[PDB]
Amino acid sequence: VGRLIYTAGGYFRQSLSYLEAYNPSDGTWLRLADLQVPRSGLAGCVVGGLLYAVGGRNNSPDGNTDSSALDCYNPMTNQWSPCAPMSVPRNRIGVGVIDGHIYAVGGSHGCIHHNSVERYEPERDEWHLVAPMLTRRIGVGVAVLNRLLYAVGGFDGTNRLNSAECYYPERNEWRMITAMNTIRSGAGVCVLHNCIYAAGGYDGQDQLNSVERYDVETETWTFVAPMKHRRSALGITVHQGRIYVLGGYDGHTFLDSVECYDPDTDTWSEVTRMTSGRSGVGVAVT
Amino acid sequence: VGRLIYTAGGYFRQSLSYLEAYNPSDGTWLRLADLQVPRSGLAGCVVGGLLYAVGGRNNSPDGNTDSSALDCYNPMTNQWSPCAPMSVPRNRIGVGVIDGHIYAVGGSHGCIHHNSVERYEPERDEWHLVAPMLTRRIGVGVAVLNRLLYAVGGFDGTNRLNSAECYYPERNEWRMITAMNTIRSGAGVCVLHNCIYAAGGYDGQDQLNSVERYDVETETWTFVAPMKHRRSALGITVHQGRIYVLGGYDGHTFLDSVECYDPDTDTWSEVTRMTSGRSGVGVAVT
Ligand code: NA
Ligand code: NA
Ligand code: NA
Ligand code: NA
């Protein structure tokens, strides 16, 4: 099939411009075209074979600037192009795709913590607001399952969250679901074999190595095997029925480690290293 | 004989836990007990031979937590002990001492820019609200002169300030005084030979190297010699009739520079370097 894991931006001493692609078949890395503006705390997603980099910020020694930007990478041309910006900047954003539309969830603009949600239509190059979440969430994770969107954990401006809620696109409304076992902001959230996984993050004291998964029909969260390395602000994605987690912060180091979860054996292994340690990347597969 | 300049906390990529002491006699630095929790934008002060660290925040890769904390350092035991916390968190706070009581002035909690002021009594370990300032002020400097407390400059949420106001403890009220020549948030404010000095800061465009002083009887601000290096969020104190400024930010670099003002000759000289560059430290002498 020949699909790659793309990692965009990140943070080490400042926000970064890197776009690199890992091939899990032959263990190779490509160095592709730099972002036009450095970005960390962003999200990656794919629609119709194009890579999108959504929100984040530029934390340099010269200043802090939260991003409302949407930028589109075409793997055929190795070129980044600007798209219409979001209504508001969103640092530590969550994103999901339903039916070829991009949903931008939560995030921060300076001291402001958003509950607002907006939807991008690629064919019209336009954003529109939809119903807001029940809870303000920054450092939030997002998963799409059965044409519904789930927002998991984060920070509401006062409290770090174990809570999660579910968006119904046809009805345009949110409902709270069963809360996680562990409080998590800056966790990796994805979907594997009809379950929502939450890996790592920060519980208010420590960076986590624990991993839990939500079965939509049993309505219960269950612990699986933990990761080797504790990490917050990790990238996460799924390639060929396996979870890959990229980089993050362990409370001392910005990690170059990539771990892989095999659901059949319930084991994690270290598969490769990024070319340099970083946190707050956006990641997607195409 | 044998008073040291203590520097506590600060920021370089993340909030710091350092306590270090400079001896201007022999040019030595001591490395003392780390703060229990990292802090930047705090203020330092001394009562009865004890050093106090008041307010600030912990800007780490996992979050931004404004601090209401008051912590006491005993140089005889090299130990930090927790004291009663303030009514509210105060980042980029101002602090002054009158009659063995600590005054906490202004600062921020998230989006909120405080005009409130509270007073700590060490003999009872309690805080109480006193009259609020006429102006909301974060990045404010404080000076005590003739048993009155002066609040100088800062940022009110919208505008940076050249305004200054005077607190009367017996009457429990504030009055505006003559405004500075220059707009300054994050200046160093101290008292030397019966005048209030404001050194450096930020005017909304540039970090400043200018220095002006207020004479309470002429009701006039006058420029003196400028520092060698422009800086905001600097530490400031007085030792043996001279002003010491420690570190800060120049719009690109976090400074390790310590400069010294001789008022007899109206000249600044570089006397030493901190072990590492940092801004937003708390400083006091004992
Ligand atoms: Na920055
Ligand atoms: Na996800
Ligand atoms: Na932070
Ligand atoms: Na002062």
From Swiss-Prot, chains A, B:
Broadly expressed, with highest levels in skeletal muscle. Changing G10C: In a NSCLC cell line; strongly reduces interaction with NFE2L2/NRF2 and reduces repression of NFE2L2/NRF2-dependent gene expression. The keyword Endoplasmic reticulum does not apply. Its main location: cytoplasm. Keywords: Cytoplasm, Host-virus interaction, Kelch repeat, Nucleus, Repeat, S-nitrosylation, Ubl conjugation, Ubl conjugation pathway. The record marks C111 as: Sensor for electrophilic agents. GO terms for biological process: cellular response to interleukin-4; cellular response to oxidative stress; in utero embryonic development; negative regulation of response to oxidative stress; negative regulation of transcription by RNA polymerase II; positive regulation of proteasomal ubiquitin-dependent protein catabolic process; proteasome-mediated ubiquitin-dependent protein catabolic process; protein ubiquitination. The keyword Ribonucleoprotein does not apply. This is Kelch-like ECH-associated protein 1. The gene is KEAP1. The chain holds residues 324 to 609 of 624 of the full protein.
